[PDB]
Design a protein around this ligand. Structure first.
Ligand SMILES: [K+]
Ligand SMILES: [K+]
Ligand SMILES: [K+]
Ligand SMILES: [K+]
Ligand SMILES: [K+]
Ligand SMILES: [K+]
Ligand SMILES: [K+]
Ligand SMILES: [K+]
Ligand SMILES: [K+]
Ligand SMILES: [Mg+2]
Ligand SMILES: [Mg+2]
Ligand SMILES: [Mg+2]
Ligand SMILES: [Mg+2]
Ligand SMILES: [Mg+2]
Ligand SMILES: [Mg+2]
Ligand SMILES: [Mg+2]
Ligand SMILES: [Mg+2]
Ligand SMILES: [Mg+2]
Ligand SMILES: [Mg+2]
Ligand SMILES: [Mg+2]
Ligand SMILES: [Mg+2]
Ligand SMILES: [Mg+2]
Ligand SMILES: [Mg+2]
Ligand SMILES: [Mg+2]
Ligand SMILES: [Mg+2]
Ligand SMILES: [Mg+2]
Ligand SMILES: [Mg+2]
Ligand SMILES: [Mg+2]
Ligand SMILES: [Mg+2]
Ligand SMILES: [Mg+2]
Ligand SMILES: [Mg+2]
Ligand SMILES: [Mg+2]
Ligand SMILES: [Mg+2]
Ligand SMILES: [Mg+2]
Ligand SMILES: [Mg+2]
Ligand SMILES: [Mg+2]
Ligand SMILES: [Mg+2]
Ligand SMILES: [Mg+2]
Ligand SMILES: [Mg+2]
Ligand SMILES: [Mg+2]
Ligand SMILES: [Mg+2]
Ligand SMILES: [Mg+2]
Ligand SMILES: [Mg+2]
Ligand SMILES: [Mg+2]
Ligand SMILES: [Mg+2]
Ligand SMILES: [Mg+2]
Lengths: 56, 252, 202, 85
RNA sequence: UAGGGAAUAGUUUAACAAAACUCCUGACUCAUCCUCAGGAGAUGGAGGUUCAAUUCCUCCUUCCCUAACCA
RNA sequence: GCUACCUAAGAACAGCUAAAAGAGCACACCCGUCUAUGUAGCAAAAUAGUGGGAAGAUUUAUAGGUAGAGGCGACAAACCUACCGAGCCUGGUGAUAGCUGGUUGUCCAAGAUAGAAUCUUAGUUCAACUUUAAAUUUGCCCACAGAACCCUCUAAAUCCCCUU
RNA sequence: CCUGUUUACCAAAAACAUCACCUCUAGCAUCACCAGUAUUAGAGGCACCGCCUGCCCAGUGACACAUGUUUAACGGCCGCGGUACCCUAACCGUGCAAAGGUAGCAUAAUCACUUGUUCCUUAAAUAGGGACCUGUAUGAAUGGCUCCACGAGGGUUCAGCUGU
RNA sequence: AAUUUAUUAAUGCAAACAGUACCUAACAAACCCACAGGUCCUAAACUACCAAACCUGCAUUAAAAAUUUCGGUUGGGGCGACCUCGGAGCAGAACCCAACCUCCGAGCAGUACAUGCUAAGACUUCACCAGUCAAAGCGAACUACUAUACUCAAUUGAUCCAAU
């Protein structure tokens, strides 16, 4: 269709719970570190990007 | 990975080798695999050969190494000359080296540190217009533009940042390099490197230390644990056949 | 042998009944062709002496081609059956009934055979005074004849050699078989020099 | 005599395929019959003869359904008749 | 959908002293033509890095070449 | 046993010109150019006249060979037993057909149709309508009140809705 | 070219074959080729003879392999700007390409324009013959152009003949 | 055109089968040695050659083939155009409404990182599928943020299957 501007990445919890969520980021920006609610520990935790799922 | 080069690497691994004398008192060399290993025994035996085959008590021990200097990827690594003195440097003295420095205080530091040939434009022009031979060259960054004239003449032997031979601090190689010994490379690039290690009278421990230093020196080109860098090693004296040392313990 | 298996499951027929085969059960995939398998050796008991192994009653593992196409047809070997193993085992007791047979390894016999048909060229330097002694002689065996000789099992023509001439060095392989080799002592010429002088030119 | 799927993929064409054994002409000696026979054999037959420790044992031990040869069954009758008589 | 490679004078290319070339002057000719010169002529873009980047990295554009690529 | 081509061993070819002939004229013989007749005919390709060839790559009797995913072919997609874009017979076979045609006694009753999807618009499946049976409760007709600004037709009307 | 051959049953012809010419493949025997052996055999194109068959191997194919070779293999064989006033450039400049359609012939059995123009033929000619031709879609062995003889081929015509 | 190489041929590997087996490039510059040659300034490691065909198995490239298909809408078919989604007119006021009717757009982007969990009652593109809105509650945020299902019109794709 058109040149992909953003990409889909898997954000994995740093608490070791294994909970992951997918977010959209710009291809040309740095790897994301986000504070996101982790249901396993039931409180907001830091999440770090691990892998790119696909190009959006 | 050309078939010949890769297949030889497979073949050299295939060659059988064994530890210790076979049970037989008298046995044909053909009947059993390659043997003689321990660096201690090797030195002791090489001295035995010196007496049996009358020859100089002090001889150049020309270590040949089957160093897997290739097969990092399917693209092969290349040969460089990471020069380092052995723990007890052998008696070879080669002291023809040149420092390029013009209209700079480095000219003093160059000679103060034992430069054989120090000069600027006049030295550069001498290299281009007339033949001159040095073992290794160094240049400050300011002189690299002028030195570029000798790039073609030296056929890539001219100073390069890759070899740490371009820098305001000349003593990187200048100070140390005189005593240090060059680890040259094969023309056929079959991984065998004809590099003297020690004089024959040198004590086995010193020759053993001299051996290990080169092992790390040669792995410097590709010192990764990802790909094994060495297969075999033959320690030959000047007047003797090569012996297959057990280098596997000494590799890391 | 080609080994195949069916793509499609065959329904169970039950006890005492034949499977119901549809035409889809004729579709096969090649599991393995056993000709490409690594070859195994054939274990035979030798009857007559052969160059590879020359002891009657020796259990030898040979290539199936060699045993099938040479030894077994010509009577040189027999199958290592339980019965044949017993027959030859009884013989080896009778062989050793008087005393236990001394061990002489097959390798040692081969070195003896090689030593029977070889002559040692002991090139010696003109400049230096030399006397050829057991330790020196063992080294020459390694370089020229290729034999790794124990120094102690060494003999010589009475007095050890000291000048160029013709002599004999008698090596005992494993202490039992003594072979005396013709000894030709010449002026020392490095292998490099001789190959340039004669092998290259001649 | 069977069928195969091209590229071992069921969704591809189904093709006819015949697998034939590799045949070798070899000479064998029968102790009971004291005669040499030139017989076409497979490598499997040679292995089976080796495991039986000879042709005579192979012929006598092997049942009819495994020999799968009229010639083999005739050799068995010949050998058995000499042993019986 | 991927990969790789390429962007040096207006034209391209040397990765090499750098040029040719078009245009534009001149000189040489008794004059004209040929000719011989000079003159300006570039390191895709952008960003960073380094004292200094065609020469270390990165994304984008254009183009070329190759190929997988399941529902 | 037709026909295409081939094999074996046979037969026929007057007269004239030229005398050399895949030469000319012209019978037998082979072929079938043009016209008419005929068109359930004498004939599922004929008759009458007129024509091409007629010692040659000719015509022709006999026996044999090549068989359908094929043969044979001086290629006309020729010919291979009256119908060959690929024979005929039997069998699979009651092939399949969203396509056309057909569908057998008497009498009564209810009964005409918004749309969606689909290699789908010559068809189907779901809605809608329609039919039978069953359950229990509202259905239709409708009074006020109520349902938009932006914008040129300030439309006929509708929706909602007790009462009846 | 000629004799010949073809759609038995609507096409006998300009279609096919053919002498000639040319390309390709093969160094060999006991069933075809052949009881043969490169002056041979087989696979093809074109079509006697006469005068000729021009340029191109980039692409496809075939062959050969270090580049490469091969068109009587499949096929192809340009445009612009200016220069003697217009009708045109021998000539130069210029982009592009493997090469840029050479000889011959030409309103043709040759897209249309088209019943082209002119001469001959008729009282009158969209017919016929000879020329002119840029055919912008002619053209040289998928052959070009002449020329004997031949044709139940297609077209035109003198004279005669006749109920056309 | 998609699918395929069973078939035929060539090639390689394996399978099968015999054995015999080239270790080649000094040079003294100095010194030694009666010679012949040696000491110093490398005298290494390598290690190969290796059974022709037929037959069988597995691959690769060709040859010659086989199987099956060649969408729809359409003022007949073809050609052209079109095929899903949203806004406006036609369709003036609840909903709905067609033409190869008239117009304009979409195949994203941006900000969040509680775009967390859970659950009454409803809407629904005329079926289904899909799609839409939401109180309360849990957990958060919070006592400045038109804060609670983000702005935005469409900004999109079922099942099987694949990857994990
Ligand atoms: K008739
Ligand atoms: K009808
Ligand atoms: K239909
Ligand atoms: K006919
Ligand atoms: K005719
Ligand atoms: K070509
Ligand atoms: K005319
Ligand atoms: K005719
Ligand atoms: K109409
Ligand atoms: Mg005949
Ligand atoms: Mg006649
Ligand atoms: Mg005639
Ligand atoms: Mg005639
Ligand atoms: Mg006619
Ligand atoms: Mg007749
Ligand atoms: Mg014919
Ligand atoms: Mg035709
Ligand atoms: Mg036709
Ligand atoms: Mg018929
Ligand atoms: Mg039938
Ligand atoms: Mg039916
Ligand atoms: Mg009624
Ligand atoms: Mg569909
Ligand atoms: Mg319909
Ligand atoms: Mg109502
Ligand atoms: Mg009401
Ligand atoms: Mg003629
Ligand atoms: Mg006809
Ligand atoms: Mg006719
Ligand atoms: Mg013709
Ligand atoms: Mg001709
Ligand atoms: Mg030509
Ligand atoms: Mg003019
Ligand atoms: Mg012309
Ligand atoms: Mg025309
Ligand atoms: Mg007329
Ligand atoms: Mg043309
Ligand atoms: Mg033409
Ligand atoms: Mg041609
Ligand atoms: Mg005529
Ligand atoms: Mg004729
Ligand atoms: Mg249609
Ligand atoms: Mg229409
Ligand atoms: Mg169309
Ligand atoms: Mg609904
Ligand atoms: Mg709430």
């Amino acid at each position: 269709k058109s040149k992909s501007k953003n990409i889909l990445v898997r954000m994995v919890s740093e608490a070791g719970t294994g909970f992951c969520f997918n977010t959209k980021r710009n291809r040309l920006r740095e790897k994301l570190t986000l504070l996101h609610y982790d249901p396993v520990v039931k409180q907001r935790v830091l999440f770090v990007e691990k892998k790119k799922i696909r190009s959006l | 990975t050309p078939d010949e080069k890769k297949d030889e690497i497979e073949k050299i691994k295939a060659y059988p080798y064994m530890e210790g004398e076979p049970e037989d008192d008298v046995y044909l060399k053909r009947l059993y695999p390659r043997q003689i290993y321990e660096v201690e025994k090797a030195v002791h035996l090489l001295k035995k050969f010196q007496i049996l085959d009358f020859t100089s008590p002090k001889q150049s021990v020309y270590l040949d190494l089957t160093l897997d200097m290739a097969l990092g990827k399917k693209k092969n690594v290349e040969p460089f000359t990471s020069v380092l003195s052995l723990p007890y440097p052998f008696a070879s003295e080669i002291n023809k080296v040149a420092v390029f420095t013009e209209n700079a205080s480095e000219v003093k530091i160059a000679e103060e540190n034992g430069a054989a040939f120090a000069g600027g434009t006049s030295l550069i022009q001498k290299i281009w217009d007339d033949e001159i031979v040095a073992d290794f060259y160094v240049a400050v960054p300011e002189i690299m533009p002028e030195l570029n004239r000798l790039r073609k003449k030296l056929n890539k032997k001219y100073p390069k940042l890759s070899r740490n031979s371009i820098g305001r601090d000349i003593p990187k190689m200048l100070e140390l390099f005189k005593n240090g010994h060059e680890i040259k490379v094969d023309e056929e690039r079959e991984n065998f490197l004809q590099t003297k290690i020690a004089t024959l009278d040198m004590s086995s421990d010193q020759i053993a230390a001299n051996l290990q230093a080169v092992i790390n020196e040669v792995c410097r080109h590709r010192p990764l644990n990802l790909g094994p860098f060495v297969v075999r090693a033959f320690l030959r004296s000047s007047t003797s056949e090569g012996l297959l040392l057990k280098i596997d313990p000494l590799l890391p | 042998t080609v080994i195949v298996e069916r793509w499609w499951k065959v329904p169970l027929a039950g006890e005492g009944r034949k499977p119901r085969l549809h035409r889809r059960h004729r579709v096969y995939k090649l599991v393995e062709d056993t000709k490409h398998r690594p070859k195994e050796n054939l274990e035979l008991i030798l009857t007559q002496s052969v160059e590879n192994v020359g002891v009657r009653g020796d259990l030898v593992s040979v290539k199936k081609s060699l045993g099938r196409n040479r030894l077994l047809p010509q009577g040189l070997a027999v199958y290592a059956s339980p019965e044949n193993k017993k027959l030859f085992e009884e013989e080896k007791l009778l062989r050793q009934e008087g005393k236990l047979e001394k061990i002489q390894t097959k390798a040692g016999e081969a070195t003896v055979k090689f030593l029977k048909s070889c002559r040692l060229e002991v090139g010696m330097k003109n400049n230096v005074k030399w006397e050829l002694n057991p330790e020196i002689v063992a080294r020459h065996f390694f370089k020229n004849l290729g034999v790794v000789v124990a120094p102690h099992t060494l003999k010589l023509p009475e007095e050890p050699i000291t000048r160029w001439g013709e002599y004999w060095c008698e090596v005992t392989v494993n202490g039992l078989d003594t072979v005396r080799v013709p000894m030709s002592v010449v002026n020392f010429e490095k292998p490099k020099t001789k190959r340039y002088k004669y092998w290259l030119a001649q | 005599l069977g069928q195969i799927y091209a590229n071992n993929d069921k969704l591809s064409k189904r093709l006819k395929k015949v697998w034939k054994p590799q045949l070798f002409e070899r000479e064998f000696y029968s102790e009971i019959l004291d005669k040499k026979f030139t017989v076409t054999v497979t490598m499997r037959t040679l292995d089976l003869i080796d495991e039986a420790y000879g042709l005579d044992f192979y012929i006598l031990k092997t049942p009819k359904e495994d020999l799968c040869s009229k010639f083999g069954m005739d050799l068995k009758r010949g050998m058995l008749l000499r042993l019986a008589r």
